[PDB]
Each structure stands twice: as structure tokens, then as C-alpha cells.
Design a protein around this ligand. Sequence first.
Ligand code: BCL
Ligand code: BCL
Ligand code: BCL
Ligand code: BCL
Ligand SMILES: COC(C)(C)C/C=C/C(C)=C/C=C/C(C=O)=C/C=C/C(C)=C/C=C/C=C(C)/C=C/C=C(\C)CC/C=C(C)/C=C/C=C(\C)C(=O)O
Ligand SMILES: COC(C)(C)C/C=C/C(C)=C/C=C/C(C=O)=C/C=C/C(C)=C/C=C/C=C(C)/C=C/C=C(\C)CC/C=C(C)/C=C/C=C(\C)C(=O)O
Ligand SMILES: COC(C)(C)C/C=C/C(C)=C/C=C/C(C=O)=C/C=C/C(C)=C/C=C/C=C(C)/C=C/C=C(\C)CC/C=C(C)/C=C/C=C(\C)C(=O)O
Ligand SMILES: COC(C)(C)C/C=C/C(C)=C/C=C/C(C=O)=C/C=C/C(C)=C/C=C/C=C(C)/C=C/C=C(\C)CC/C=C(C)/C=C/C=C(\C)C(=O)O
Ligand SMILES: COC(C)(C)C/C=C/C(C)=C/C=C/C(C=O)=C/C=C/C(C)=C/C=C/C=C(C)/C=C/C=C(\C)CC/C=C(C)/C=C/C=C(\C)C(=O)O
Ligand SMILES: COC(C)(C)C/C=C/C(C)=C/C=C/C(C=O)=C/C=C/C(C)=C/C=C/C=C(C)/C=C/C=C(\C)CC/C=C(C)/C=C/C=C(\C)C(=O)O
Ligand SMILES: COC(C)(C)C/C=C/C(C)=C/C=C/C(C=O)=C/C=C/C(C)=C/C=C/C=C(C)/C=C/C=C(\C)CC/C=C(C)/C=C/C=C(\C)C(=O)O
Ligand SMILES: COC(C)(C)C/C=C/C(C)=C/C=C/C(C=O)=C/C=C/C(C)=C/C=C/C=C(C)/C=C/C=C(\C)CC/C=C(C)/C=C/C=C(\C)C(=O)O
Lengths: 38, 34, 38, 36, 38, 39, 39, 39, 38, 40, 57, 53, 57, 56, 59, 179, 49, 49, 49, 49, 48, 60
Amino acid sequence: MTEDEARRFHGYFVTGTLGYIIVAAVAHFLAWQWRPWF
Amino acid sequence: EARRFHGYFVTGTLGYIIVAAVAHFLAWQWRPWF
Amino acid sequence: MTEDEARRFHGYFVTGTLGYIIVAAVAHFLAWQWRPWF
Amino acid sequence: EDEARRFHGYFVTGTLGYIIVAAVAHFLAWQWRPWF
Amino acid sequence: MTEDEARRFHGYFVTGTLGYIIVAAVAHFLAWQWRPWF
Amino acid sequence: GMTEDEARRFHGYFVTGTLGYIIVAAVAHFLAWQWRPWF
Amino acid sequence: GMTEDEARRFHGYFVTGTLGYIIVAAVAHFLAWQWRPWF
Amino acid sequence: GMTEDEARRFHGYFVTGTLGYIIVAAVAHFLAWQWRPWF
Amino acid sequence: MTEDEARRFHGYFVTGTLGYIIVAAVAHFLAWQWRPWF
Amino acid sequence: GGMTEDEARRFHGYFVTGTLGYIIVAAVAHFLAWQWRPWF
Amino acid sequence: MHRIWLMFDPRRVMVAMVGFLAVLALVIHFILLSSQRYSWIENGTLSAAQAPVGASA
Amino acid sequence: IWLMFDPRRVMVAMVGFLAVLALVIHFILLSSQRYSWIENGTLSAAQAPVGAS
Amino acid sequence: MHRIWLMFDPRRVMVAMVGFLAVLALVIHFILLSSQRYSWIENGTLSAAQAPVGASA
Amino acid sequence: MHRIWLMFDPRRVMVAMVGFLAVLALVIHFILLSSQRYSWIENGTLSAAQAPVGAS
Amino acid sequence: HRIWLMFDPRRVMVAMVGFLAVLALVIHFILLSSQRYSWIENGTLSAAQAPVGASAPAA
Amino acid sequence: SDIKAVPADSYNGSALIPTGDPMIDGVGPSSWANRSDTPDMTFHNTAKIVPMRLDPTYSIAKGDPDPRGLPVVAADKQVAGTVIELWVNRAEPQVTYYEVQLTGSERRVMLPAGFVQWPNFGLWGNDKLLVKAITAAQFANVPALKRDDQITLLEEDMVCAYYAGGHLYAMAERSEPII
Amino acid sequence: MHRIWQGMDPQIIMSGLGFFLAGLALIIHMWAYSITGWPKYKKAQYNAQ
Amino acid sequence: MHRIWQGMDPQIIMSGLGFFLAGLALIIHMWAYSITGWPKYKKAQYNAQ
Amino acid sequence: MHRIWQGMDPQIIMSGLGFFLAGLALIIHMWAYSITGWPKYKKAQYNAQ
Amino acid sequence: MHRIWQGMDPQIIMSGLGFFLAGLALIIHMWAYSITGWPKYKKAQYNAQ
Amino acid sequence: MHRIWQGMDPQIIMSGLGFFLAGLALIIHMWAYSITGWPKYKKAQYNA
Amino acid sequence: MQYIDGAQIALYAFWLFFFGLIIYIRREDKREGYPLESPQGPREGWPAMPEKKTYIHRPT
Ligand code: BCL
Ligand code: BCL
Ligand code: BCL
Ligand code: BCL
Ligand SMILES: COC(C)(C)C/C=C/C(C)=C/C=C/C(C=O)=C/C=C/C(C)=C/C=C/C=C(C)/C=C/C=C(\C)CC/C=C(C)/C=C/C=C(\C)C(=O)O
Ligand SMILES: COC(C)(C)C/C=C/C(C)=C/C=C/C(C=O)=C/C=C/C(C)=C/C=C/C=C(C)/C=C/C=C(\C)CC/C=C(C)/C=C/C=C(\C)C(=O)O
Ligand SMILES: COC(C)(C)C/C=C/C(C)=C/C=C/C(C=O)=C/C=C/C(C)=C/C=C/C=C(C)/C=C/C=C(\C)CC/C=C(C)/C=C/C=C(\C)C(=O)O
Ligand SMILES: COC(C)(C)C/C=C/C(C)=C/C=C/C(C=O)=C/C=C/C(C)=C/C=C/C=C(C)/C=C/C=C(\C)CC/C=C(C)/C=C/C=C(\C)C(=O)O
Ligand SMILES: COC(C)(C)C/C=C/C(C)=C/C=C/C(C=O)=C/C=C/C(C)=C/C=C/C=C(C)/C=C/C=C(\C)CC/C=C(C)/C=C/C=C(\C)C(=O)O
Ligand SMILES: COC(C)(C)C/C=C/C(C)=C/C=C/C(C=O)=C/C=C/C(C)=C/C=C/C=C(C)/C=C/C=C(\C)CC/C=C(C)/C=C/C=C(\C)C(=O)O
Ligand SMILES: COC(C)(C)C/C=C/C(C)=C/C=C/C(C=O)=C/C=C/C(C)=C/C=C/C=C(C)/C=C/C=C(\C)CC/C=C(C)/C=C/C=C(\C)C(=O)O
Ligand SMILES: COC(C)(C)C/C=C/C(C)=C/C=C/C(C=O)=C/C=C/C(C)=C/C=C/C=C(C)/C=C/C=C(\C)CC/C=C(C)/C=C/C=C(\C)C(=O)O
């Protein structure tokens, strides 16, 4: 609502998005070692 | 104003196309389609 | 929509339309060299 | 009527211009592959 | 919806109908020279 | 439509336009007869 | 549309362009006749 | 739209622009004829 | 847009056109000495 | 509408000198590439 | 005689005849296209002597 | 002239009629043997298929 | 051009033409992909001489 | 330029654009998956010389 | 950072989570259909023994 | 702001919250249309919906309970009144409304037959009328008529809208999720 | 005999006569081409020289 | 004489005259190409080398 | 003769002239390429050697 | 001669022209590549090593 | 000459120049890779 | 011809008729509650809303 809470939310949203991307990167690197697709 | 949204929409659109252009460069090195 | 707005819009519409035709013309010439259909 | 006659000028020219372009298209197709 | 209205309409309606018939006569004569059906 | 004077002036032009059309057509048929007579 | 004075002026210009188109076409047929004469 | 005064001035520019296109295209056809005549 | 600013713009346009045409003429001259197309 | 006459005059200065520096740098890159593998 | 337009509406009539003429023209063109003699898309270049003729009995 | 038919309705109807007719003709030719230009458009006129005599 | 945007709503024309061009582009693309000669996903690396051609007659 | 947003509201155009891009991306990825040459899940590790090519 | 003024954060979160769940399930299901990545059955194979898809030879 | 409802938040597409008591102000399911303020007429220019006391040729078919003098059990399982007169449709013969006299009388209200249910689906003993849409207290706030013998289409919408709006507004529980 | 034209738009007569003459000359020209054998014989000379 | 143009549009007349001349010049040029065989014979001379 | 331009926008006159001139010039360049055999013969010179 | 630009946006003209020029330069460069055969002959010199 | 930028957004101009420069440099680098045979000959040297 | 047959022609004629009918019925569907209200202004889908239709009632 207010810009004070629009700054709090965006901080957790970006960190949550960044955390989700990183674990997906680790998962893709694990799968590449086991069975690469290229 | 519409000027503020135009700056973000143009930069977002041109950035998206450039990243897609790099994806086509990578796919060409792997398996060309022409 | 008055006559003044119908002029500034027309200049952008004609320019956008002409640009669409030019890219299509380039694509058709590019496809002709690759594999002509006549 | 002033508005009708002005529209008639653009419609008649547009119809005739469209038909001439179609005639050129049939001329090019005839050179490529005549149907008679 | 009046007697005067039918004067202007009839001239263009007759000319249009006559023009349609004449062009159809030319088309039928062209088709006869190409491949007669009798 | 037309009036009495309008139809009188129109009719004289339409007759000399018709007559002039016949003369040029007569020459064309006469020219075509020497080249390839059709009887 | 056009007025009677406007039509008198139009007709003279239209006639001028008609013969100019016809004379220039006559030269085209003359040139084409020497090259490959029909009938 | 267009008025009488600016129609003559535009016509003068249109005629000289049209005419110049003709001689410019005339040399192109002359240069093409010396290279490969089409008759 | 206006009468007076279309006089100066046309001057900038003409000089840009000639400079573009002249520089292209040099390109065609260099290409003709390398691989003439006739 | 952004970039009035005074702003457009000053921006045109940096944009012009930016183009010159980019072109000069590309000139060196083409010079170095030509001695390595000339394309004509 | 133009008083016929006072008994039938010109706007309705001319729309009906344009529609009926278009349907008739499409029907005739499609019947000829389905036939053997006048399948002009395929055999239009044949001369009148080479065109197919129906069986003679 | 354009006082009995509302040119706006006519233009939309005419554009729709022309677009439908153009698609119909183009698709009929594409289904034919002689004018299947996507596949056989590079053939010359003498090489193109012709229906039987 | 003079009064084309005054009699036709440009927003309605903008959406109608964009939707029409999108559908037409997909139809042409899918027609070419379904053909033998222009199945570019499979045979796009072939040269013009080696591309399939329809049978001549 | 920017006045297109005074005619089309930014919110509706963005939702339609995102929807069209997602459908197009899925269609192209699925078209390639169904092909012999670009079934990257299956062949994938083949070199460009070993990849399938359509008949001449 | 102003995207949350024009869109409800509560509704964007639900839309994003739903989209990610659908996408993840689709990719896992496609790989389970494939021969090379049907990991439930052949996950113990090494990359040298994993299936590789190829086209039919010319002869 | 002539509809007496305010948006929940500033995000478009959000639902409205009524400001006052939505039953009376006509919001949401209690909304009514602005129909004509004239009675409906039959094929012979007579009032379509009339009480039985204005037309003694109408009667109740045999084997059908006479609902007059029967208690009206509301959503509280408390009697809200007694039926005293029936309003019938003359164009197509059918009961359209029930007239209910309240417990402390002093007023009469209308009750559409569409919200009336009978015990055991009308199979066993029919000794009362079930009205699940409204509470016994809100029977007193049903809109009244201008005349005691005819009902216009405007008020016909108002009575029906008021009862239909009480499936969401009779009690706070009816406007809440079940889980 | 100018009384025939009284009451009819002159543009209609001229445009209706133009349709007649244009369509008639087209039919007779194709009629005449098959009779005279022109341009079949002249086209044979140039196209089979 | 000149009165035939009265009540007309100069642009309509020139639009229909250009349509006439363009459509007729297309027909006769294809007519003339097949009669003379011009582009065919000259094309064969240059496309045989 | 200059009074024909009265009434219409000079931009439309020039906009409709470029479409004519660009459309025509592309047809005749294609027409001329096949007639003269250029650049077919020059392209074949550089491909062969 | 300069009055053609009256009532026209200079940004639009430069956008319409520079994008006409970009498309024409791309078409003629591809045209010139197949005529001269330039990339082909030089690429084959480096692909033979 | 400077007046062509009047009324325009400087960030839009720089965004459209970065698009042009990045897209154009990506096409020519691919063009140049196939002409020179740049990575191929050296990759084949080390990967022998 | 060979690929084109009567059943296909009839099917496509029916398709054109059906699309026209759907356009007509969609026009009839917009005789109540239109034009739509939006913050950007009035809105109508395709097909556009038709002209106002008036009924006839018996006299009293
Ligand atoms: C044979 C085919 C190839 C391959 C070839 C390509 C090519 C070529 C491309 C992709 C692209 C993409 N591929 Mg694929 N791809 C392959 C296999 C996969 C697999 C898989 C399971 O194997 C996956 C999950 C993906 C996934 C993806 C997506 C990440 C992306 C398309 C998203 C999109 O368009 O959204 C559209 C819908 C949206 C809602 C957009 C969402 C936001 C997007 C992602 C970014 C917006 C802009 C960004 C924020 C930058 C802003 C501006 C700044 C100024 C820089 N690919 C195989 C190996 N793929 C495309 C791409 O864009 O890559 C970058 C692309 O061009
Ligand atoms: C074997 C027969 C002889 C011959 C014998 C005669 C004789 C005998 C006579 C003529 C006459 C005429 N002939 Mg000759 N004529 C021959 C060959 C030709 C050729 C030619 C190049 O082959 C041409 C152009 C002409 C031309 C003409 C006209 C000048 C004249 C008829 C005028 C008239 O009423 O037109 C009708 C008016 C028109 C406008 C016709 C227009 C036709 C076009 C097709 C209409 C449609 C145009 C439209 C825009 C095209 C659209 C393109 C797309 C399809 C949409 N002849 C050969 C050599 N001809 C007659 C005459 O009057 O001579 C003085 C006459 O008596
Ligand atoms: C065998 C067939 C060929 C081929 C031949 C062609 C040909 C030929 C053409 C295309 C064209 C297109 N091809 Mg294809 N193409 C092939 C394979 C592909 C593949 C693929 C996965 O393999 C893809 C994704 C595409 C994709 C595309 C699109 C980019 C484009 C059609 C879009 C369109 O009109 O949308 C509908 C339109 C819209 C939604 C509106 C878009 C508006 C744009 C974004 C803005 C314009 C105005 C703006 C202001 C302009 C400013 C510039 C200046 C004013 C000049 N092609 C194969 C290899 N392709 C066509 C095209 O239109 O190119 C331009 C075209 O002519
Ligand atoms: C084996 C059969 C022959 C052939 C034999 C004939 C014959 C014979 C005739 C036609 C006719 C026509 N043919 Mg066919 N036709 C063939 C192949 C084709 C092909 C094609 C793809 O190959 C096409 C597109 C056409 C198309 C046409 C139309 C131009 C025309 C019917 C118009 C119409 O709908 O009237 C019905 C329409 C309405 C009732 C409403 C619309 C009316 C408007 C005015 C029509 C305008 C068309 C034209 C300009 C008419 C002049 C109008 C006046 C100038 C006012 N034919 C083959 C080669 N065709 C007919 C015709 O009239 O030709 C002129 C005709 O007589
Ligand atoms: C062959 O296979 C096929 C399938 C065909 C090929 C595939 C093709 C395609 C098209 C793929 C598409 C990929 C794609 C599309 O773009 C992929 C895009 C992915 C994206 C964008 C992922 C983003 C994820 C973001 C996440 C997870 C964020 C989490 C945030 C968290 C947890 C924080 C929340 C908590 C908060 C905020 C509390 C603070 C509250 C506060 C302070 C308060 O209340 O105040
Ligand atoms: C298998 O073979 C089968 C198929 C079976 C064989 C059968 C074939 C058949 C039966 C064919 C029938 C064909 C036919 C006839 O029926 C075909 C009829 C064709 C016709 C007539 C086409 C006419 C087209 C006209 C057009 C495009 C006009 C466009 C106008 C424009 C651009 C101007 C508008 C500009 C405006 C408004 C702005 C100015 C206004 C201003 C400033 C203002 O108003 O102020
Ligand atoms: C399948 O066929 C098998 C079975 C094989 C056998 C077939 C058998 C049979 C049964 C065939 C039947 C054939 C037939 C009859 O039935 C055929 C009938 C044909 C007829 C009659 C055609 C007539 C066409 C007339 C037209 C096109 C007229 C157009 C008029 C125009 C353009 C004028 C417009 C004027 C305007 C705009 C000015 C407005 C002024 C105004 C408003 C003013 O002044 O205010
Ligand atoms: C296979 O062969 C088959 C077919 C079987 C064999 C065929 C057989 C048959 C039967 C053929 C029929 C032939 C025929 C019919 O009888 C032929 C009939 C031909 C006729 C009649 C031709 C008439 C032509 C008239 C013309 C050119 C007039 C032009 C007038 C002009 C230029 C003047 C215009 C200007 C004016 C007026 C000024 C306006 C002033 C105004 C308004 C003012 O001042 O108000
Ligand atoms: C296959 O073989 C088949 C086909 C069977 C063989 C058969 C062939 C046949 C039958 C052919 C028929 C040919 C024919 C005749 O019938 C052909 C007729 C040709 C004719 C008539 C050509 C006339 C051309 C006229 C021109 C170019 C005039 C241009 C005028 C201009 C430029 C001036 C405009 C006026 C202005 C500027 C003044 C403005 C004033 C204003 C505005 C004011 O005052 O307001
Ligand atoms: C191959 O087989 C087939 C195809 C069958 C073969 C057959 C082919 C046929 C039949 C071809 C026919 C060709 C033809 C017909 O005649 C071709 C006719 C061509 C013509 C006429 C070309 C004319 C060009 C004119 C030009 C370029 C003029 C430009 C003017 C300019 C630049 C100046 C503008 C100045 C302005 C605006 C100032 C405004 C001032 C203002 C506003 C002010 O001052 O206020
Ligand atoms: C396969 O065969 C095929 C190949 C197809 C055969 C081909 C055939 C054909 C027919 C090809 C045609 C080629 C052609 C057609 O004629 C080619 C025509 C080319 C032309 C005309 C190019 C013109 C270029 C013009 C330029 C570059 C101008 C630049 C101007 C500049 C930079 C100045 C900008 C102004 C400013 C900054 C003012 C600011 C101040 C302001 C605003 C103020 O002060 O207010
Ligand atoms: C396959 O082969 C094919 C493809 C066929 C062969 C190819 C053929 C062709 C035709 C190629 C085309 C080439 C081409 C076309 O001309 C190439 C054109 C290149 C050009 C023009 C490049 C221009 C670069 C410009 C640069 C880098 C400028 C940078 C500016 C900077 C950094 C300053 C930033 C601004 C500031 C700081 C001001 C702040 C604002 C302030 C202060 C304010 O406002 O206050």
C-alpha cells in the first residue's frame, strides 16, 4: 500500500527470486554432471 | 505521465530482444538451421 | 478525435506501416536467395 | 452533398487503383504460367 | 419514396444493369471462342 | 432532366458525333476489304 | 461539380492532351512498324 | 487544403522535377543500349 | 513544421543527402576497381 | 517534452564526440584484424 | 418505367439481387470446375479439339 | 450517391468480401496439380502439370 | 488519409489489423512448414538445388 | 511515440503482450521438440554433422 | 520497484507460484516421457550407457 | 457515489463493500431494476396480479392445502406472521404472492411464492410455510405498495429483490467462506 | 427529332452508349480475328522464323 | 460540346481516364508481345551464352 | 493546366507518386534482368573463376 | 522547394528515411554478395587450411 | 543539427543506440567468424 | 477438380454461412447493457452494437 511497505516487500521478493534462481542453477549443474543434454 | 512508462517499456523490450538474439547465437553454434 | 489529432497519428501510422513493409521486403529477399519459389 | 462527393473521389480512385494493381498481378502470373 | 426519386435511380440502375449484361455478353463470346459448349 | 433547348442542342451534337463515327468506320471497313476480303 | 465556365476550360485542356497523347502514340506505331511490321 | 495561388507554384516545381526525371532516365536507357541493345 | 523552420531543415537535408551520395560514389569506385560488375 | 533547445545542443556535443571515439577504436580493431586475416 | 421503385424498396431490392447474382455466379463457376470438359484450372491450356467430350451413344 | 448506404458499412463489407474471395482463390490454386506453386513453382510452363485430353 | 481516422476509430483499426496480421503470418508459416520444399526445420540446411520439387508433367 | 499509452492503457497491453509471448515461446519450443533434427531432449549431444537432415 | 503499485502483490504472488508449479510439472513430465531422461527406470546408468536418439541411416 | 458502496482497495477489479444496510439501499443481490411504475395488464386491459378477494372466480384446486391462516416460519425458526390473502396471476393462473399479517398485526407485507417452501417438499403434513431467505425481523422492512389491490412492475421488482438479497445479507455468516 | 432526349441525364446516355460500343467492338474484333486468320498467320512468321 | 463535363468532378474524370489507359495499354502490350515475339527472341540471344 | 492540383494535399500527390514509381521500377528491373541476362552472366563469371 | 516539409515532424522523416535506407542497403548488400561472390571465395581460402 | 534531438528522451536515444550497436555487432561477429574461420582453426589445434 | 470435390465446397459454404450467422447473433446479443463502461471510455467488441430497437405495445 504505502511506499514504506512497497520497499519492504520488494526487498524480500527480489531475495526470494534470487534464492530460487540460485537453487535452480545448482540443480541444473548437478543434472549436467550426471547426464548432459548437449 | 506516459513518458515515464515509455522509457521502461522500450528499455525492457529492447533488452528482451537482445537476450533472445544471444540465445539464437548460441543455438546457431550448436546446430545451425540453414 | 479531431483533425489535429488525426494528423499526428497518421504520421506515426504511415511510418510504422512503411517500416513493416521494409522488413518484410528484406525477409522476402533473404528467403529468395536461400530457396527461390519460382 | 459536399461530404458524399468528396468520399466518392477517394472510393472511385481506390477501386480503380486496386483493379489496376490486380491486373498487373495477373500479367506477371501469365508470364510465369499461363492458364489458357 | 417519391416520384422524383425514381428518375435519378432508374438512370443509374438501367446503365449499371446494361453494363453488367454487356460485359457478360463479352465473357460468353470469349468462352465460346475458347471452348464452345454446343 | 433536360429541357427543350437542352435536348435540341444535345441532339445536334449526338448526330454529328454519330455521323462522324460512321465515316471513320466506313474507311476502316474499306481498308480491311482490300487486305482480306471476307466474302 | 464543375460549372459551365469551368467545363469550357477543362474541355480545351482535355482536348489538348488528347491529341498530344495521340501524336506521340503515332510515332510509337511508326517506329514499331519499321522494326516488325504486322499484317 | 490546396488553393489556386499555391497550385501554380507547386505545378512549376512538379513540372521541372518531372522533366529532370526524364533526361536522367534517358541517359540510363542510352547507357544501357550501348551495353546490351534489346532489339 | 512551420514555414521558416522548413527552409533551414531542407538545407540540412540537402547537404546530408549530397554528402551521403558522394561517399557512396567513392565506395562504388573502389568496388569497381576490385570486382567490376559488367 | 524533455531535452529543450539548450539541452539538445549540449547532448549533441557528447553524442558527436562519443561517436568519434567509438569509430576511432573500431578503426584500430579493423587495422589489427587486417594484418591477421585480410578479407580481400 | 420508374414507378416500379415506388412499389418495391430500391435499397432492399438491389441488395437481394446482388446477393442472388453472386450465389448464382459461384454455383455456375463451381459446377464447371467440377466437370471434365471445363476444369479450366488443370486443362485450360488444351485446345477445343483436345478438350474432353462426354460419351456418345 | 453515398447517402443511401452508409459508406462505413459498405467498406467493411467490401473488405471482408475481397479478403474471403482472395483466400478462396489462392487456396483453390494451392490444391490443384498445375498451380501448387509452393512445391512446383520452380517448374517452367512446359514442365507444369496439365489435365488429360 | 485526410478523413480516414475521423470516420474509422484508430484504436479499433489498430487492434483489428494487428490481430489479422498475426493470424495471416501464422497461416503462411504453417502452410510452408507442412510442405515438402519449405519444411525448413528439417531441410533448411539443404541448398536450392537439393530442395524438393513437385513432379513435372 | 509515448502518446500510444494515452490510447492504449499500459496495463492491458502488457498483459496481452506477456500472454502472446508465452504462447509463442511454448509453441516454438514444442514445434522443435516434435522435429527429428531438433529433438534436443533425445539427440541433444549429437554434433551438427551427426544431426538429422531432411531428405533431398 | 513501482510494479507493486500497479499490481496487487498478493495476486501477483499467487499467479507466479501457480505458473512456476505448472511449468515445473510439465518439464518433469516431459523428461519422464523421454527415453534418455526416464530417470525412474534408467537413472542408475552412466552417461556412456544413456540412450541417445538418432535418425535412420541412409542404407 | 449514488450506489452506497465503496471499493475494498485501490486495485481495479476489486469488489465493493456496502456502506449502509444493503437490504434497503438495494446493492448487490438486493439490487432492483428501474422498471415501469405501472401495473402489468392482461390481454383485456386488467391488472395481471390481483388478490383473490378482487376476483371470486378463482379458487384452490382440490387436494392442495389452503395456505391462508397458516404460520410463516422464517430463517430463525420463529413465526413471522400468518398468511391471510393470496395474489394470483390472471394471465396464467398461478399463485404469485402471499400476503402476510405480522404477529403484532398493525401492517401487512407481501411474500413472493418463489421463496416459499413447504415442509417435507409438500409430501407430508403441510402446516406452515418455510422462508429461508429472510429473518422474522426483516419481514417488517419489506417495501410496501401504493395501493391495496394492484402492484406495479417497479414495486414487484423491489419485493423480489429484497427477498433474494437476503440469501447473502440475512446474517453475517451467509456472506462468509465456509473454510 | 430531338424530343427523345428530353428528360434524360446526358451523362447517362453517353455512358450507356459507351458500354454498348466498347462491348460490341470487342465482340466483333474477336469475331473478325477468327475470320481473317489475323494475327495467327503473322504471329507464325515471327514466332517460327 | 464542353457542356458534357458540366456537373462532374475533374478528379473522377482523370481517375477513370487513367484507369482506361492503364488497363488498355496492358492488354495491347501483351497482345503485341505475343504477335511480335519481341522479349522472347531477344531473351534467347542473351540467355544462350 | 496548373489548376488540376487545386483541392488535394500535395503530400498525397507525392505519396501516390512514389508508390507508382517504386512499384513500376521494380517490375521493369525484373523485366530487364531476364531480358539482358544480367547479372546472370557476370555472377557465373565469378563463380566459375 | 523547401515547403514540402511544412507541417511535418523532422523526427518522423528521419525515422522513415533512415529505415528506408537500412532496408535498401541490406537488400543491395545481399544482391552484391551473390554477384561478386566475395565472402565465398575468401572464406574458402581460409576453410581449406 | 543539434535541433533534431529537441523534444526527445535522452535515455530512449541511448537505449535505441545500445540496441542497434549490440544487435549489429552480434551479426557482424557471426559474419566475421565464418569468413575468417576464427575459433574453428584454433579450437581444432588445442582439441586434437 | 481432382482434390477439390463437392463435399469440401459445401463444407466451406456452410462455414461462411455459420460465421455470418454468428456475427448476426453476436450483434443481437449487444442490444442490452451497451456500450460498455471502462475508465478509458466507451467500449464495444466486434461486432459493434446495433441500432436501438423499439417494440410496439397495444393501446390502452
Ligand atoms: C532447440 C531449442 C533450444 C532452445 C532455444 C531457445 C532460443 C533460441 C530462445 C529460447 C528462449 C527461452 N528458452 Mg528455450 N531452448 C531449448 C530448451 C529450453 C528448455 C529446456 C527444458 O530444455 C527451457 C526451460 C527453455 C527455456 C527458455 C526460456 C527461458 C526462454 C523463453 C521465454 C520467453 O520467451 O518468455 C516470453 C514470455 C514472457 C512472460 C517473458 C518473461 C520475461 C523474459 C524471460 C525476460 C524479459 C526481459 C528481461 C527482464 C530483460 C530486460 C531488459 C534489460 C534492459 C536487459 N529452453 C533448446 C535447447 N530458447 C528464448 C529467449 O528469449 O531466450 C532468452 C529464445 O530466443
Ligand atoms: C482483323 C480485324 C482488324 C481490324 C479491323 C477493324 C475494322 C473493320 C474497324 C476497326 C475499328 C477499330 N479498331 Mg481495328 N482491327 C484490327 C486490330 C486492331 C487493334 C489491335 C492492336 O489489334 C486495335 C487497338 C484496334 C482498334 C480499333 C479502334 C480504334 C476502332 C474501334 C473503336 C471503338 O468503337 O472502340 C470501342 C471502344 C472502346 C473503349 C473499346 C475498349 C476495349 C477495352 C478492352 C475495354 C476495357 C478497358 C479496361 C480499362 C481494361 C481493364 C484491364 C483489366 C482487364 C482490368 N484494331 C485488325 C487488324 N478495326 C472500327 C472503327 O470504328 O474504325 C474506325 C472498325 O470499323
Ligand atoms: C520458409 C519460411 C521462412 C521464413 C520467411 C519469412 C518471410 C518471407 C517473412 C517472415 C516474417 C516473419 N517471420 Mg518467418 N521465416 C521462417 C522462420 C521463422 C521462425 C522460426 C521459428 O523458424 C520465426 C519465429 C519467424 C518469425 C517471423 C516474424 C518475426 C515475422 C512475422 C511477424 C508478423 O508479421 O507478425 C504480425 C505483425 C505484428 C504483430 C505487428 C508487429 C509490429 C512491429 C513490431 C513494429 C513495426 C512498427 C515500428 C514503429 C517500426 C519502426 C521502424 C522504422 C519506422 C523503419 N520466422 C522460415 C525460415 N518470415 C515476415 C515479416 O513480416 O517480416 C517482417 C516476412 O515477410
Ligand atoms: C469455364 C468458366 C470460365 C469463366 C467463364 C465466365 C463467364 C462466361 C462469365 C464469367 C463471369 C465472371 N467471372 Mg468467370 N470464368 C472462368 C474463371 C474465373 C476466375 C478464375 C479464378 O479463373 C474468376 C475470378 C472469375 C470471375 C468472374 C467474375 C469477374 C464474373 C462474375 C461476376 C459476378 O459475381 O457476377 C454476379 C454478381 C452479382 C449478382 C453482384 C455484383 C455485381 C457487380 C457489378 C459485378 C462486377 C463484375 C464486373 C466488373 C461486371 C461489370 C459491372 C458494370 C461495370 C457495372 N472467372 C473460367 C475460365 N466467367 C460472368 C460475368 O459477368 O463476367 C463479366 C460471365 O458472364
Ligand atoms: C521444452 O520445455 C518447454 C517447457 C516447452 C520449454 C519452456 C519454455 C518456456 C516458455 C519457459 C519459461 C521460462 C520462464 C518465463 O519467463 C521463467 C521465468 C521464471 C521466473 C520469473 C521466476 C521467478 C521466481 C520468483 C520467486 C520464486 C520469488 C519468490 C519470492 C519470495 C519467496 C519472497 C516472498 C515473501 C515475501 C515478499 C514476504 C515479505 C512481505 C512483506 C515485507 C510485507 O508484507 O510487508
Ligand atoms: C474458383 O473460381 C471462383 C472463385 C469460383 C470464380 C468465381 C469468381 C467470382 C464470382 C468473382 C467475383 C468478383 C467480383 C464481383 O462480384 C469482384 C469485385 C471486385 C471489386 C468491385 C473490388 C473493389 C475494390 C475496391 C476497393 C478495395 C476500394 C478501396 C477504397 C479506398 C482505399 C479508399 C478509401 C479511403 C477513404 C475512405 C478515406 C478518404 C475519405 C475521406 C477523406 C472523406 O470521406 O472525407
Ligand atoms: C445453376 O444454373 C444452372 C442450373 C446450370 C442453370 C441456371 C438457370 C437459371 C434459373 C438461371 C437464372 C438466370 C437469371 C434469372 O433468373 C439471371 C438474371 C440476371 C439479371 C436480372 C441480372 C441483372 C443485373 C443487374 C445489375 C448487376 C445491376 C446493377 C446496378 C447498378 C450497379 C446501379 C447502381 C446505381 C447507383 C448506386 C445509383 C444510386 C442512386 C440513387 C440511390 C438515387 O438516385 O437516389
Ligand atoms: C457475331 O456477329 C454478330 C454479333 C452476330 C453480328 C452483329 C449484328 C448486329 C445486329 C450488330 C449491331 C450493330 C449496331 C446496331 O444496330 C450498331 C449501332 C451503332 C450505333 C448506333 C453507333 C452510334 C454511335 C454514336 C456516337 C459515337 C456518338 C457520339 C457522340 C458524341 C461524341 C457527341 C457527344 C457530346 C455531346 C452530346 C455534347 C453534350 C452537350 C450537352 C449535354 C448540352 O449542350 O446540353
Ligand atoms: C486484343 O485486341 C483488342 C483489344 C480486341 C483490340 C481492340 C481495341 C480497341 C477497340 C481499342 C479502343 C481504343 C480507344 C478508343 O475506343 C482508345 C481511346 C483513347 C483515348 C480517347 C485517349 C485519350 C487520352 C487523353 C489524354 C491522355 C488526355 C489528358 C488530358 C490532360 C492531362 C489535361 C487534363 C486537364 C486539366 C489539367 C485541366 C484542369 C482544369 C480544371 C480542374 C478546371 O477547370 O476546374
Ligand atoms: C513489362 O511489360 C509491361 C509492364 C506491359 C510494359 C509496359 C509498361 C508501361 C505501359 C509503362 C508505363 C509507364 C508510364 C506511363 O506513362 C510512366 C509514367 C511516368 C511518369 C509520368 C513519371 C513522372 C515522374 C515525375 C517525378 C518523379 C517528379 C517529381 C517531382 C519532384 C521531386 C518535385 C516535387 C516538388 C514539390 C512537391 C514542391 C512542393 C511545393 C509546395 C508544396 C509549395 O511551394 O507550396
Ligand atoms: C535486386 O535489384 C535491386 C537491388 C532491387 C535493384 C534496385 C532498383 C532500384 C529502383 C533501386 C532504387 C534506389 C533508390 C531510389 O531512387 C535510392 C534512393 C536513395 C536516396 C534518395 C537516398 C537519400 C538519402 C538521404 C540522406 C542520407 C539524407 C540525410 C540527411 C541528414 C543526415 C540531415 C538530417 C537533417 C537534420 C539533422 C536537420 C536537423 C535540424 C532541424 C530539425 C531544425 O533545424 O529545425
Ligand atoms: C552481413 O553483412 C551485412 C550486415 C549485410 C553488412 C552490413 C552492412 C551495413 C549497411 C552496415 C551498417 C553500418 C552502419 C550504418 O551506417 C553503422 C553505423 C554506426 C554508427 C552510426 C555508430 C554510432 C555509434 C555512436 C556511439 C557509440 C555514440 C556514443 C555516445 C556516447 C557514449 C555519449 C553518451 C551521451 C552523453 C554522455 C550525454 C548525456 C546527456 C546529457 C549530458 C544531457 O542531456 O544533459
